[PDB]
Design a protein around this ligand. Structure first.
Ligand code: BCL
Ligand code: BPH
Ligand code: BPH
Ligand code: BPH
Ligand code: MW9
Ligand code: MW9
Ligand code: SPN
Ligand code: SPN
Ligand code: SPN
Ligand code: SPN
Ligand code: SPN
Ligand code: SPN
Ligand code: FE
Lengths: 76, 255, 325, 44, 273, 51, 44, 51, 44, 51, 51, 44, 51, 44
C-alpha cells in the first residue's frame, strides 16, 4: 500500500498544475497561480493518502478487529 | 589605534598566533591517525627503510565492556592473515599480485576478510545483537514488501532456492541478513545474504554479484541462532568478491 | 544496478525502546509515551520520543517562548493589530535595536527597551540549554565533546550580540530580530567597514566552512560504499578492526596519498566544524575596534590587486550600438 | 449481511436516527439566520 | 611502503581501459590510464599559469591574475595574452577533473566498493562547469567567467552580486545557504557524538550504539540512527551544491532586474485587501 | 432513501464525525471572511458609515 | 448496546447533564455580555 | 445498464465514497469561484448596483 | 463470480440499488437549482 | 434530541475537553483582536478621544 | 474484432479503470479551459455583451 | 489460454460486454452535446 | 452546577494546576504590555506629564 | 463509578471545596483592583 500513497501524491501534483492554468485564465500571473497550485498539491494529496489509503482492505477482518477493540475498552 | 612596529598591529599578532596554533593542531591530527597499520613494510613483508616525516604516537588504552579486557594502541597486528595464496608479478615494489588458486575460496583481493574475534557482537544487556526473526518477540513487517517465501534468482538468471527467514538487529530495529534454503540441485543447507546486496521485487529477490554455481560455497555459520564477527566478515567478503571474480569479462577492461 | 542503500526495502517494528540506565536514575525524569512514523523510517529510525525533562530544559523553553512572544506581539502591534497585513508583511517586520544616541544606557521602551528585555530572556534560554547538554553527558558517563562544540557557536553568538556592543560603547551595534531586516544588517555591516572579503579571519572562516561541507560529502559517501561490509557499525570497527575500515582507508590512500582511521576521521570533522565560529568571532571582534577599512588595510599590507584597463561603458561600446539603432 | 465496522443493522438504524435528529436542528437555525440576514440586507 | 594489511588487496584487474599497461603504483598512488591523463593536464595547466604570471610581471601568490577576454570577442578565441590563456587553462582543468573522477571509479572497482564518491564529486564538477561554460554560453561571451586569482576571484563575486542590487533576496540562494549551515551543524553533532562515545572519562568503560541513541532521544526526543546520519549528511551536501548552481544560472540568463523586485508577486496577490 | 442508515455499515463514525467537525467550521469561517472582503456586506464598516 | 469508548449507558447521562449545565451557564454569561455591548455601541 | 451493479465487485466502496465526496466538493467550490470571478454573474456586486 | 472486493452478487445489487437513490436525489436538487438560476440570469 | 448523550459512547471525554478549551480561548482572543483592529470599536482610542 | 474482449486477459480491470477516469476528467477540463481562453467561444463574456 | 491477470475466458467476455455498453452511453451523450453546441456556435 | 467537582475524576489536578498557573501569568503580562503600548493608559508617562 | 484518575467521590469533593475558596479570593482582589482603576481612569 505504498503504491496507493504514491498514486495519491501524483493526483495532487496534477491538480496543482491545473490550478495554475485556471488562475491564469482568470487573470493571475504564473507565480501567483503556482503558489496556490503547490498548496493544492500538498493539502489535497496529503489528505487523500491518509483517508483513501487508510480505508485498507479487510472485510470481516475489519469487523472482528473493531469488535475486539471494543473489548479492550470496557476493562481499560 | 597604534602599531607595535612598522605595520604590525593587533590583527597581525592574532593572525600569526593562529598560524602557530594551526600548525600544532595539524601535527596533532596527523599523529592521532597513525594508530593502525604502522610501521610500514615492503612487498616482501620486511620493514621498509622509509617511515615518513611524522613519528608514531604514544599509547592509549580502551576499557571494553562485558569483561572483554583492554585494548592498547598502537600495538601488534592481531587481525593479520597467515597464509595467503598470492604470487608476486615482479621482483621489486609497486606491481600487482596474482592469485595462486581460486580467489573466491582463498579470500584474496576483493574477497579478502580480516581475522576478527570469534564471538558475536553484544547489545547493552549482554545478549547477541543479531537474531533470526522467528525468535524475536514482538517483531513484524510494518512497511514495504515482505520477502519471506519468494524465490531467489542469481546473477546469470537461475533460481537457487527460497527465502525462509530474516535476521534482524533488535536494538536498532533493522534487518541485517536474509536466510536462503537451497534446492538440492544447487547445494544443501541454508545460507545468508547481507541486506545491502539484494533487490526485493514483487515476485522475486535478485542477487547480481554471484552466479548460481557459486551458491554452494558461501561460508556457513556454526550455530543456527547466532553468528560471530569472523563469520560475518567471511560471508560479506565472499559476496563482495563476485563483483570482480564471477565472470572473466568482469575482470578484463570494459573499454 | 546494484542496491544503493538510500532507502530501506522493508521495515520491521517491535516494542519501543525506553533507554539505558545506571545509578543516576534517568528514568525518573523521562516522559512516558512514544510513536512511530513510517514516512521517516524510509531514511532513518521510525520511533518518536521519549524525551528527558530537567530544570535546565524547562527554564530554557519558558524563557525562549517569552522572547518569541515579545517580538511577535511587538511586530503585531506595529501593524495596528491587523492579522491579514501581519501575514502579508511577516518577512519584512522586525524588533529594532536602540538608537545610537543612547549609548549603553537604558533606552525608552519605544526605542529599544523591549529589545533589551527580550535579549536578556534569549540569553538566559541559550545558556540553560548548554548546561543541559553538559549535565546529560555527565549523567550518561560520556565525554563532553557535544557541549564544547555547542560553546564554539555560542562564542560567535555572544560576540555578535554582547561583547562587541560593549567594547564599542553602544547597544545600537546589535542585530535586529527579523528575516529580511537581519540580512540588510549583514550587507550594511560589510559596506560600512570597507569590504569584508579582505578581512583575513573572514577568509579563514570561509575556508573552514567549505572544508566541513566537503568532508561530509566525502565521509557520507565513503561510509555508504562500505555498508556491504558492515561499515555503519563504527564503534565496533574501532574496538575490533574489520575489512570495511581497511578498504575505506585504502581507497583514500590510493587516491590522495594519505588516509585516516575509523576513530580519527571524526576528530578531523569535529575540528573543521568547530573552527568556523571561532575564527569568525575573532574576525568580527576586530572590526571597528581596531580596523576601520579592510580594503585600505589590504592595500597597506600588499595583497590588493591592481587593474590596468579603464572604467566606463563608452571605453568599450556606444549607447546607440547597445540598443541596435 | 455486509459490515466493515462491526456494527449490526439495529445499531446502524439507532445511530442514524440520532444523527438525523441532530442534523435537522442545525439546518433550522441556519434557515432562521438566513431569513434575518435577507431581511436586514437582501442579495437577490 | 605498504600498511600492515594492504598487500592482500593489491591484485590485478578492474580497469575501465588500459589493461595491465598502466596497472601499477608509484609510492602510495595508483596510476592507470586516467592517472596519466590527469598528470599531463594538471602539469600543463600549472606551467601555463606560471608562464602567464611571469609575463604579467609579478610572482606574488596574492597578486597573480589570469583573466577571461573582453565581451567584444563573444564566443570566439582571443589572443593568448588578452584572455586566450584563460581558455586553454579552462580546457585543461575540465580534463583534469574528469580524469580524477574516472580514476576514482577504477579504484572503487578494484576494491569491490560502491561508486558513491565519484557520483558525489560529479556534483562539484557540475557547479564549476556552470560557472565557466554554461552561464557564459547562454549569456553569449566567455568573458562572463571568473578570473584565476586568489584575491581577484573575490572581486568577481562582489561585482556579480551587486549587479542584481541585493543578492540576499535571491530565493534559490536562501535555500543554498540554509543547506550549507545545516550540513555544518550536523557534521559537528555527528563527530561530537562518536568521539564522546569512544572517549569516556578516565576510569570508565566505552559505550555502544544504544547509549548514543539514548543520549539523543533524551536531548531532543529523536535519534536518526547510525545509518540514517550518513544518508542525511550526503543528501544535505549534494543539495547544497545543486542549489548553488541554480542560484547563479538564473541570475544572469533568467532574471535581469533586482532580486527584491522579484518578490512583488507575493506583495500584490489578489487575495490581499 | 429509507436505506441510508447503512452508511454506518461502511464508514467509521469517529473519523466521519471528526472530519465533519473540521469541515463545517472551516467553511463557516471562509464564508464569514468572504462577506467581510466586500463593500456592501461588511458590517464593521457599515456601522461607522451610519454614525 | 454500542460503545466505542468503554462507558455504559447510565454513565454517559450524568456526564451529559453536567456538561449541559456548564454550557447553559457559559451561554447566559455570553448573552448578558452581548446585550451590554449592543447597548454601549450598536452594529446593526 | 442492468449489470452496472457489478462495479462494486472491482472497486472498494469506502475508497470511492471518500474520493467522490472530495471531488464533488472541490468541483462545486471551483465553479462558484469561477462565477465570482466575472462581472455579469457576480451576485455580490449586482446587489450593490441594484440598490 | 469474480469479486476482487470480496462481495457477493446480492450484496452488490443491494448496494447499487440504494446508491442510485442518492444520485437521483442529488441530481433533482441540482436540476431545480440550475432552472432557478437560469430564470434569474440566463447564460444562453 | 433526548439521545444526544450517546456522543460520549463514541468520543472520549478527556480529549474533547482539551480541544474545546483551546478552541474557545483562541476564538475569543481572535475576536477581541479583530475588534481592536478597527477605528469604531477600539475602546482605548475611544477613551482617548472622549476626554 | 469480436476478440477485443481478450484485452482483459492482459490488462487489470482496476488499473485501467482508475487511469481512464483520471485521463477523461483531465481532458474534459483542459478542453473547457481552452475554450474559455478565446474570444468567440467564451459564453460568460457573450452573456454580458448580449444583454 | 493466456491469462496474465486472474481471469478466465468467460469473465472477460461479460466484463467487456457491459463496459462497452457504458462506452456507448457516454458517447451517445457526448454526440448530443456536440450537436447542440454546433447549432449554437459553429466552428466549421 | 453542584456536580462540578467531578472534573477531578476526569482530569489530573497536577497537570491542570501547572497549566493554569502558566496561562494566568502570561495573560496578565500581555494586558499590562497592551496597556503600556497605548497613549492614554501608560501610567509612567502620566506621572511625567502631570507634574 | 467512572474514575479515570483513581480518586474517589469524596476526595474529589474535598479538592474542589478547597479550590473554589482560592478562586474566590483571586476574583475578589481583582474586582477591588478594577474598581480603583475605573475611578482612577475610566475606559467606558
Ligand atoms: C555583503 C555580505 C558580506 C558578508 C558578511 C558577513 C558578516 C557580517 C558575517 C559573515 C559571516 C560569515 N560569512 Mg560572510 N559575507 C559575505 C560573503 C560570504 C560568502 C560568499 C560570497 O560566498 C560566504 C561563503 C560567506 C560565509 C560566511 C561564514 C563563513 C561566516 C559565518 C560563520 C558561521 O559559523 O555561520 C553560522 C552561524 C552561526 C554560528 C550563528 C550562531 C547561531 C546561534 C548559536 C543560534 C542559537 C540558537 C537560536 C537562538 C534558537 C533558534 C530557535 C530554535 C528552533 C529553538 N560570506 C559578504 C562579503 N559574513 C560571519 C562571520 O563570522 O564573519 C567573520 C558574520 O558575522
Ligand atoms: C536541529 C534538530 C531539530 C530537532 C529535530 C526533531 N525533533 C523532534 C523530531 C525531529 C526530527 C521528531 O520527529 C520529534 C517529534 O515527534 O516531533 C513532533 C521531535 C521532538 N523534539 C522535541 C523537542 C525539542 N527539539 C528541539 C530541537 C530540535 N529537534 C531541533 C529544532 C528542542 C529545542 C528547543 O532545542 C526541543 C524542546 C519535541 C517537540 C519532540 C519530542 C518527541 C515526543 O515527545 O514524541 C512523543 C510521541 C508522540 C506520540 C508524538 C508523535 C506524533 C504522532 C501522534 C505520532 C504518529 C506519527 C505520525 C505517523 C507522523 C507524525 C510525526 C511527524 C514528526 C513526522
Ligand atoms: C559549530 C557551529 C555550527 C553549530 C553547531 C551546533 N549548534 C547546536 C549544537 C551544536 C554543536 C547543539 O548542541 C545545539 C542543539 O541542541 O542541537 C540539536 C545547537 C543548536 N543550534 C541551533 C540553531 C542554529 N545553529 C546555527 C549554526 C551552527 N551551530 C553552526 C553551523 C544556526 C545558523 C544561523 O546557522 C542556527 C539557526 C538550535 C537548533 C540549537 C540551540 C537550541 C537552543 O538553544 O534553543 C533555545 C530554545 C528556545 C528559543 C526556546 C523554544 C522556543 C521556540 C521559539 C518554540 C518552541 C520550540 C519548538 C520545538 C520549535 C517550533 C516547532 C513547532 C512545530 C513546535
Ligand atoms: C557537495 C560538493 C562539495 C564537494 C565534493 C567533493 N569534492 C571532492 C570530492 C567530493 C565528494 C572528492 O572525492 C575529491 C577528493 O579527492 O577530495 C580529497 C574532491 C576534491 N575537491 C577539491 C577541492 C574543493 N572542493 C570544494 C567544494 C566541494 N566539493 C563542495 C563543497 C572546493 C571549494 C571552492 O569550496 C574546493 C577547492 C579537491 C581538493 C579534490 C580533488 C580535485 C583534484 O585533485 O582534481 C585534480 C586536479 C589537480 C590536482 C590540479 C588541477 C590543475 C588545473 C589544470 C589548473 C588550475 C586551474 C584552476 C581553475 C585555478 C583556480 C584558481 C583559484 C584561486 C580561483
Ligand atoms: C605550501 C605547500 C602546499 C603547496 C601550495 C598549493 C596548495 C595549497 C593547498 C593545500 C595544501 C594541501 C597539501 C597536502 C598534500 C599532502 C601530500 C601527502 O600525501 O603527504 C603525506 C604527508 O601529509 C599528511 O600526512 C597530511 C598533510 C595534511 C593534509 C592537508 C591539510 C589541509 C588543511 C587545511 C586546508 C588548507 C588551507 C590553508 C589553511 C591555512 C591555515 C592558516 C605523505 O604521506 P603519509 O604516509 O601520509 O606521511 C605522513 C605520515 O604517515 C608519516 O609516516
Ligand atoms: C602528477 C601531477 C601533479 C599535479 C600538479 C599540480 C601541483 C599541485 C598538486 C599537488 C601538490 C602535492 C605534491 C606532494 C605529494 C608528494 C608525494 C608523496 O607524498 O610521496 C610520498 C613521499 O612523501 C613526501 O614526499 C612527504 C611530503 C610532505 C608533506 C608536507 C606536510 C604538510 C603539508 C601540507 C599542509 C597544508 C597546510 C597549509 C599549507 C601551508 C604550510 C605547508 C611517498 O610515500 P610512501 O613511499 O608511501 O611513504 C612515505 C610517506 O610515509 C612519507 O614519506
Ligand atoms: C511536423 O513535425 C513533427 C515532429 C510535428 C511530426 O509530426 C513528425 C511526425 C512523425 C515522424 C510521425 C511518425 C509517426 C509514426 C511512425 C506512427 C506510427 C504509428 C503506429 C505504428 C501506431 C500503432 C497503433 C496501434 C494500435 C492502435 C493497436 C491497437 C490494437 C488493438 C486494439 C488490439 C489489441 C487487443 C487485444 C485483444 C489483443 C489480443 C489478446 C490476446 C490475449 C489474444
Ligand atoms: C460563494 O461560493 C463559495 C465558494 C464562497 C462557497 O461558499 C461555496 C460553498 C459550498 C459549495 C458549500 C457546500 C456545503 C455543503 C455541501 C454543506 C453540507 C452540510 C451538511 C451535510 C451538514 C451536516 C451537519 C450535521 C450535523 C450538525 C449533525 C449533528 C449531529 C449531532 C449533533 C449528534 C451526533 C451524535 C450522535 C449521532 C451520537 C449517537 C450515538 C449512538 C451510539 C446512537
Ligand atoms: C472569521 O469570521 C468571524 C471573525 C466573523 C468569526 O468570528 C466567525 C466565528 C465563528 C464561525 C464562530 C463559531 C463558534 C462556535 C461554533 C462556538 C461554539 C461554542 C460552544 C459549543 C461552546 C462549548 C462549551 C463551553 C462550555 C463552558 C462547556 C462546558 C463546561 C463544563 C464545566 C462542563 C463540565 C463537565 C463535567 C465536570 C462532566 C463530569 C461528569 C461526570 C459524570 C464525571
Ligand atoms: C483586549 O483583548 C485581549 C485579546 C487583549 C484580551 O485580553 C483577551 C482576553 C481573554 C479572552 C481572557 C480570558 C480570560 C479567562 C477565560 C480567564 C479565566 C480565568 C480563571 C478561570 C481563573 C481561575 C483561577 C483559579 C484559582 C486561582 C483557583 C485556586 C487557587 C488555589 C491556591 C487553590 C488551592 C488548591 C488546593 C490546595 C488543592 C487542595 C488539595 C487537596 C488534596 C484537598
Ligand atoms: C466550464 O469549464 C470548467 C473546467 C470550468 C468546468 O467547470 C468543468 C467541469 C466539469 C468537466 C465537470 C464534470 C462533472 C462531472 C463529471 C460530474 C459527475 C457527477 C456524478 C457522477 C455524480 C454522482 C453522484 C452520485 C452519488 C452521490 C451517489 C451516492 C451517494 C449515496 C448513495 C449516499 C448514501 C450511501 C449509502 C447508504 C451507502 C450504501 C451501502 C449499503 C451497504 C446499502
Ligand atoms: C503574535 O503571534 C504569535 C503569538 C504567534 C507570535 O509569538 C509570533 C511570533 C513571531 C512571528 C516571531 C518572529 C520572530 C523572528 C522572525 C525572529 C528572528 C530572530 C533573529 C534573526 C534573531 C537574531 C538574533 C541574534 C543575533 C543575530 C546575534 C546575537 C545576539 C545575542 C547575543 C542576543 C543576546 C543579548 C544579550 C546578551 C544582551 C542582553 C542585555 C543585558 C543587559 C544582559
Ligand atoms: Fe561516521
Amino acid at each position: 500500500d505504498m503504491t496507493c500513497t504514491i498514486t495519491c501524491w501524483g493526483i495532487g501534483v496534477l491538480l496543482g498544475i491545473m490550478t495554475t492554468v485556471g488562475l491564469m485564465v482568470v487573470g493571475w500571473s504564473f507565480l501567483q497561480g503556482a503558489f496556490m497550485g503547490v498548496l493544492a498539491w500538498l493539502i489535497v494529496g496529503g489528505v487523500l493518502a491518509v483517508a483513501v489509503c487508510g480505508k485498507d482492505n479487510a472485510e470481516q477482518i475489519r469487523a472482528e478487529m473493531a469488535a475486539a477493540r471494543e473489548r479492550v475498552r470496557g476493562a481499560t | 589605534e597604534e602599531t607595535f612596529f612598522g605595520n604590525f598591529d593587533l590583527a597581525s599578532l592574532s593572525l600569526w598566533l593562529f598560524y602557530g596554533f594551526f600548525a600544532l593542531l595539524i601535527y596533532y591530527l596527523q599523529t592521532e591517525n597513525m594508530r593502525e597499520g604502522y610501521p610500514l613494510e615492503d612487498e616482501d613483508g620486511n620493514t621498509a627503510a622509509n617511515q615518513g616525516p611524522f613519528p608514531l604516537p604514544k599509547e592509549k588504552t580502551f576499557k571494553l565492556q562485558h569483561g572483554r579486557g583492554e585494548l592498547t594502541l598502537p600495538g601488534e597486528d592481531v587481525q593479520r592473515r597467515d597464509n595467503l595464496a598470492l604470487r608476486k608479478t615482479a621482483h621489486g615494489n609497486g606491481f600487482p599480485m596474482e592469485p595462486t588458486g581460486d580467489p573466491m575460496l582463498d579470500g584474496v583481493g576483493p574477497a579478502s576478510w580480516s581475522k576478527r574475534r570469534d564471538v558475536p557482537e553484544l547489545d547493552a544487556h549482554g545478549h547477541p545483537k543479531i537474531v533470526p526473526m522467528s525468535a524475536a518477540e514482538g517483531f513484524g513487517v510494518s512497511a514495504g514488501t515482505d520477502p519471506r517465501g519468494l524465490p531467489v534468482m542469481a546473477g546469470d538468471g537461475e533460481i537457487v532456492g527460497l527465502v525462509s527467514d530474516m535476521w534482524i538487529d533488535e536494538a536498532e530495529q533493522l534487518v541485517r541478513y536474509l536466510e536462503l534454503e537451497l534446492d538440492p540441485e544447487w547445494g544443501d543447507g541454508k545460507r545468508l545474504v547481507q541486506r545491502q546486496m539484494v533487490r526485493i521485487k514483487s515476485d522475486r529477490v535478485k542477487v547480481r554479484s554471484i552466479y548460481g554455481k557459486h551458491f554452494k560455497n558461501v561460508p556457513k555459520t556454526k550455530s543456527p541462532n547466532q553468528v560471530t564477527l569472523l563469520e560475518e566478515d567471511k560471508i560479506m567478503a565472499y559476496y563482495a568478491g563476485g563483483t570482480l571474480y564471477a565472470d572473466e569479462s568482469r575482470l578484463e577492461p570494459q573499454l | 544496478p546494484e542496491y544503493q542503500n538510500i532507502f530501506t526495502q522493508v521495515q520491521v517494528q517491535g516494542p519501543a525502546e525506553l533507554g539505558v540506565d545506571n545509578e543516576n536514575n534517568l528514568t525518573e525524569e523521562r516522559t512516558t509515551g512514544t510513536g512511530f512514523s513510517q514516512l521517516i523510517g524510509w531514511i532513518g529510525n521510525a520511533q518518536l520520543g521519549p524525551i528527558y525533562l530537567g530544570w535546565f530544559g524547562i527554564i530554557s523553553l519558558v524563557t525562549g517562548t517569552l522572547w518569541f512572544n515579545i517580538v511577535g506581539f511587538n511586530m503585531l502591534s506595529q501593524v495596528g493589530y491587523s492579522i491579514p497585513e501581519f501575514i502579508r508583511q511577516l518577512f519584512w517586520l522586525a524588533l529594532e535595536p536602540p538608537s545610537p544616541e543612547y549609548g549603553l544606557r537604558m533606552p525608552p521602551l519605544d526605542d529599544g527597551g523591549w529589545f533589551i528585555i527580550a535579549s536578556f530572556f534569549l540569553l538566559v534560554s541559550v545558556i540553560s540549554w548548554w548546561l543541559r547538554t553538559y549535565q546529560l553527558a555527565e549523567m550518561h558517563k560520556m565525554g563532553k565533546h557535544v557541549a564544547w562544540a555547542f560553546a564554539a557557536a555560542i562564542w560567535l553568538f555572544l560576540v555578535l550580540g554582547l561583547f562587541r556592543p560593549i567594547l564599542m560603547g553602544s547597544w545600537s551595534e546589535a542585530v535586529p530580530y527579523g528575516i529580511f531586516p537581519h540580512l540588510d544588517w549583514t550587507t550594511a555591516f560589510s559596506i560600512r567597514y570597507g569590504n569584508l572579503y579582505y578581512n583575513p579571519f573572514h577568509a579563514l572562516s570561509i575556508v573552514f566552512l567549505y572544508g566541513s561541507v566537503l568532508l561530509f560529502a566525502m565521509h557520507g559517501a565513503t561510509i555508504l560504499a562500505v555498508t556491504r561490509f558492515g561499515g555503519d557499525r563504527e564503534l565496533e570497527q574501532i574496538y575490533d578492526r574489520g575489512t570495511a575500515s581497511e578498504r575505506a582507508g585504502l581507497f583514500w590512500r590510493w587516491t590522495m596519498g594519505f588516509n585516516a582511521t575509523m576513530e580519527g576521521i571524526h576528530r578531523w570533522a569535529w575540528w573543521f566544524a568547530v573552527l568556523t565560529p571561532i575564527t569568525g568571532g575573532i574576525g568580527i571582534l576586530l572590526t571597528g575596534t581596531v580596523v576601520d577599512n579592510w580594503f585600505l588595510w589590504a592595500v597597506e599590507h600588499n595583497f590588493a590587486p591592481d587593474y590596468t584597463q579603464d572604467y566606463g561603458y563608452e571605453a568599450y561600446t556606444t549607447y546607440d550600438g547597445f540598443l541596435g539603432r | 449481511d455486509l459490515s466493515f465496522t462491526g456494527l449490526t443493522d439495529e445499531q446502524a438504524q439507532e445511530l442514524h436516527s440520532v444523527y438525523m435528529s441532530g442534523l435537522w436542528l442545525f439546518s433550522a437555525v441556519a434557515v432562521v439566520a438566513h431569513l434575518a440576514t435577507f431581511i436586514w440586507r437582501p442579495w437577490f | 611502503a605498504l600498511l600492515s594489511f594492504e598487500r592482500k588487496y593489491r591484485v590485478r584487474g578492474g580497469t575501465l581501459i588500459g589493461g595491465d599497461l598502466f596497472d601499477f603504483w608509484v609510492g602510495p598512488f595508483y596510476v592507470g590510464f586516467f592517472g596519466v591523463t590527469t598528470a599531463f593536464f594538471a602539469l600543463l595547466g600549472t606551467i601555463l599559469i606560471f608562464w602567464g604570471a611571469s609575463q604579467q610581471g609579478t610572482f606574488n601568490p596574492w597578486l597573480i591574475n589570469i583573466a577571461p577576454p573582453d565581451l567584444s570577442y563573444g564566443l570566439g578565441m582571443a589572443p593568448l595574452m588578452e584572455g586566450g590563456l584563460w581558455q586553454i587553462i579552462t580546457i585543461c582543468a575540465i580534463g583534469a577533473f574528469v580524469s580524477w573522477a574516472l580514476r576514482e571509479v577504477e579504484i572503487c572497482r578494484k576494491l569491490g566498493m560502491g561508486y558513491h564518491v565519484p557520483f558525489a564529486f560529479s556534483v562539484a564538477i557540475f557547479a564549476y562547469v556552470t560557472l565557466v561554460v554554461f552561464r557564459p554560453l547562454l549569456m553569449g561571451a566567455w568573458g562572463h567567467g571568473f578570473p584565476y586569482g586568489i584575491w581577484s576571484h573575490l572581486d568577481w563575486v562582489s561585482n556579480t552580486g551587486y549587479a542584481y542590487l541585493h543578492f540576499h533576496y535571491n530565493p534559490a540562494h536562501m535555500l543554498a545557504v540554509t543547506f550549507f549551515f545545516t550540513t555544518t551543524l550536523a557534521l559537528a553533532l555527528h563527530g561530537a557524538l562518536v568521539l564522546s562515545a569512544a572517549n569516556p572519562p578516565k576510569g570508565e568503560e566505552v559505550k555502544g550504539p544504544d547509549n548514543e541513541d539514548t543520549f539523543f532521544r533524551d536531548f531532543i526526543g529523536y535519534s536518526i540512527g547510525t545509518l540514517g546520519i550518513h544518508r542525511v549528511g550526503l543528501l544535505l551536501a549534494l543539495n547544497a551544491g545543486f542549489w548553488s548552481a541554480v542560484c547563479i544560472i538564473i541570475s544572469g540568463p533568467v532574471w535581469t532586474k533586482g532580486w527584491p523586485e522579484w518578490w512583488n508577486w507575493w506583495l500584490e496577490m489578489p487575495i490581499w485587501p | 432513501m429509507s436505506k441510508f442508515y447503512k452508511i454506518w455499515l461502511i464508514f467509521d463514525p469517529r473519523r466521519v464525525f471528526v472530519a465533519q467537525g473540521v469541515f463545517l467550521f472551516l467553511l463557516a469561517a471562509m464564508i464569514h471572511l468572504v462577506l467581510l472582503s466586500t463593500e456592501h456586506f461588511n458590517w464593521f464598516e457599515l456601522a461607522a458609515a451610519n454614525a
